[PDB]
Design an enzyme around this catalytic site. Sequence first.
Site, PDB file in Angstrom:
ATOM      1  CG  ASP A 161      -2.135   0.952   0.990  1.00  0.00           C
ATOM      2  OD1 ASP A 161      -2.301   1.467  -0.136  1.00  0.00           O
ATOM      3  OD2 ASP A 161      -2.891   1.178   1.958  1.00  0.00           O
ATOM      4  CG  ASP A 199      -2.404   2.507   5.840  1.00  0.00           C
ATOM      5  OD1 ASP A 199      -2.775   1.559   6.565  1.00  0.00           O
ATOM      6  OD2 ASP A 199      -3.169   3.092   5.045  1.00  0.00           O
ATOM      7  NE  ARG A 203      -4.046   5.504  -0.022  1.00  0.00           N
ATOM      8  CZ  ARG A 203      -3.829   4.935  -1.204  1.00  0.00           C
ATOM      9  NH1 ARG A 203      -3.513   5.681  -2.254  1.00  0.00           N
ATOM     10  NH2 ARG A 203      -3.928   3.619  -1.336  1.00  0.00           N
ATOM     11  CG  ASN A 204      -0.743   4.780   2.974  1.00  0.00           C
ATOM     12  OD1 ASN A 204      -1.581   5.356   3.668  1.00  0.00           O
ATOM     13  ND2 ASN A 204      -1.048   3.756   2.186  1.00  0.00           N
TER      14      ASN A 204
HETATM   15  C1  LIG Z   1      -2.854  11.561   3.861  1.00  0.00           C
HETATM   16  C2  LIG Z   1      -3.854  12.017   4.922  1.00  0.00           C
HETATM   17  C3  LIG Z   1      -3.201  12.198   6.290  1.00  0.00           C
HETATM   18  O1  LIG Z   1      -2.216  11.593   6.540  1.00  0.00           O
HETATM   19  N1  LIG Z   1      -3.818  13.097   7.252  1.00  0.00           N
HETATM   20  C4  LIG Z   1      -3.117  13.666   8.397  1.00  0.00           C
HETATM   21  C5  LIG Z   1      -2.132  12.947   9.060  1.00  0.00           C
HETATM   22  C6  LIG Z   1      -1.472  13.472  10.158  1.00  0.00           C
HETATM   23  N2  LIG Z   1      -0.423  12.709  10.846  1.00  0.00           N
HETATM   24  C7  LIG Z   1      -0.519  11.273  11.115  1.00  0.00           C
HETATM   25  N3  LIG Z   1       0.300  10.747  12.002  1.00  0.00           N
HETATM   26  C8  LIG Z   1       0.242   9.450  12.263  1.00  0.00           C
HETATM   27  C9  LIG Z   1      -0.678   8.635  11.606  1.00  0.00           C
HETATM   28  C10 LIG Z   1      -0.730   7.144  11.923  1.00  0.00           C
HETATM   29  O2  LIG Z   1       0.215   6.458  11.718  1.00  0.00           O
HETATM   30  O3  LIG Z   1      -1.901   6.601  12.460  1.00  0.00           O
HETATM   31  C11 LIG Z   1      -1.705   5.420  13.180  1.00  0.00           C
HETATM   32  C12 LIG Z   1      -2.109   4.253  12.285  1.00  0.00           C
HETATM   33  C13 LIG Z   1      -2.561   5.515  14.439  1.00  0.00           C
HETATM   34  C14 LIG Z   1      -1.525   9.235  10.677  1.00  0.00           C
HETATM   35  C15 LIG Z   1      -2.587   8.468   9.861  1.00  0.00           C
HETATM   36  C16 LIG Z   1      -2.519   7.156   9.413  1.00  0.00           C
HETATM   37  N4  LIG Z   1      -3.636   6.891   8.738  1.00  0.00           N
HETATM   38  C17 LIG Z   1      -3.953   5.615   8.114  1.00  0.00           C
HETATM   39  C18 LIG Z   1      -4.442   7.997   8.714  1.00  0.00           C
HETATM   40  C19 LIG Z   1      -5.718   8.217   8.129  1.00  0.00           C
HETATM   41  C20 LIG Z   1      -6.335   9.454   8.251  1.00  0.00           C
HETATM   42  C21 LIG Z   1      -5.701  10.484   8.953  1.00  0.00           C
HETATM   43  C22 LIG Z   1      -4.449  10.269   9.528  1.00  0.00           C
HETATM   44  C23 LIG Z   1      -3.816   9.006   9.404  1.00  0.00           C
HETATM   45  N5  LIG Z   1      -1.404  10.534  10.466  1.00  0.00           N
HETATM   46  C24 LIG Z   1      -1.791  14.745  10.596  1.00  0.00           C
HETATM   47  O4  LIG Z   1      -1.117  15.279  11.700  1.00  0.00           O
HETATM   48  C25 LIG Z   1      -1.737  16.385  12.287  1.00  0.00           C
HETATM   49  C26 LIG Z   1      -2.779  15.477   9.941  1.00  0.00           C
HETATM   50  C27 LIG Z   1      -3.441  14.933   8.847  1.00  0.00           C
HETATM   51  N6  LIG Z   1      -4.474  15.695   8.156  1.00  0.00           N
HETATM   52  C28 LIG Z   1      -5.689  15.704   8.954  1.00  0.00           C
HETATM   53  C29 LIG Z   1      -3.995  17.057   7.959  1.00  0.00           C
HETATM   54  C30 LIG Z   1      -4.890  17.802   6.966  1.00  0.00           C
HETATM   55  N7  LIG Z   1      -4.069  18.374   5.911  1.00  0.00           N
HETATM   56  C31 LIG Z   1      -4.911  18.815   4.817  1.00  0.00           C
HETATM   57  C32 LIG Z   1      -3.307  19.495   6.434  1.00  0.00           C
END
Ligand SMILES: *CCC(=O)Nc1cc(Nc2ncc(C(=O)OC(C)C)c(-c3cn(C)c4ccccc34)n2)c(OC)cc1N(C)CCN(C)C
Length: 312
Positions: A137, A155, A141-142
């Site tokens: 995967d 992921d 995005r990951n």
């Molecule tokens: C590509 C979308 C995204 O990553 N959104 C995102 C992610 C994060 N940081 C972050 N940190 C750790 C993890 C993680 O490993 O989660 C484990 C499995 C508990 C994740 C993450 C992993 N997956 C599968 C996700 C799905 C959806 C959302 C996050 C994860 N993500 C941050 O840090 C603040 C923000 C963020 N988005 C909401 C930011 C929005 N942008 C448009 C700025």
Amino acid sequence: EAPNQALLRILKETEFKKIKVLGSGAFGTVYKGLWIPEGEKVKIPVAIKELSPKANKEILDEAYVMASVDNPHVCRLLGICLTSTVQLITQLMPFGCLLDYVREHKDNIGSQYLLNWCVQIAKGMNYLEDRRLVHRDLAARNVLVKTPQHVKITDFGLAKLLGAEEKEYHAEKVPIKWMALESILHRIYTHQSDVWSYGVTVWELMTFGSKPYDGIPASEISSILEKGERLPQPPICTIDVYMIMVKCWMIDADSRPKFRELIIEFSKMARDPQRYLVIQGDEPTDSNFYRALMDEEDMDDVVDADEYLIPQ
Ligand SMILES: *CCC(=O)Nc1cc(Nc2ncc(C(=O)OC(C)C)c(-c3cn(C)c4ccccc34)n2)c(OC)cc1N(C)CCN(C)C
């Protein structure tokens, strides 16, 4: 292969708190949170995931995979919380995924950062290949952003450890646009199939977040790649860079480059980045910063998970 002596840590529900939802998709819900180990005088920004017996089995599979990897360019597992729905506690990446990052900062990302990210992603995947791990995967995005200069692969919900004599993994819902041709036709997954997804991932970065095969149904993609058609050459990409993407998308899986070789090629280009990426105008860790995204006032004792290497 060798005995997997990794330590699975169990975290108390009272030690950490959730703060905000980062995403609520088919995988489940990923929370932004803070972990305070009791008596340690440390605040750790964490990400918490929760997906019934089937939900607990899948996330424990992901915890088992993440606990077996430890690399500066791979997201590290912190532990699990044994609630009714067991939760996955990982290191929080403050800047989010690289896909949203390149879309938000499209007019400010230089050639040095794009090539550096390609080196770091290949380092993480090469480590996973050393660990006999097939990610399945790999996508923009990951690939999350710890700092603009440091990214990590994440992921592992589809990640599969291989047996010592197991060269391929046979699968039995997937991302079609990032999969190798042999994965779409025969459900065969290999480290070389991850190289294909690596090529699509680099293509996402060089197009600043464009959707691959935009507007094309995934059903017709199997016939497109089989006819010999591939993703177009991004405008900022020299032929040196685009040739590497085409090599990752070759039909013969063994003809595609290995992650070990991809580290070297992109590292050479990182020495002279303007020679291989043409971008017009090619020219934050504070206590205050964590107070904002964690919505807390006292952040003197903040410690990133990379600096917290504590046996329980
Ligand atoms: C590509 C979308 C995204 O990553 N959104 C995102 C992610 C994060 N940081 C972050 N940190 C750790 C993890 C993680 O490993 O989660 C484990 C499995 C508990 C994740 C993450 C992993 N997956 C599968 C996700 C799905 C959806 C959302 C996050 C994860 N993500 C941050 O840090 C603040 C923000 C963020 N988005 C909401 C930011 C929005 N942008 C448009 C700025």
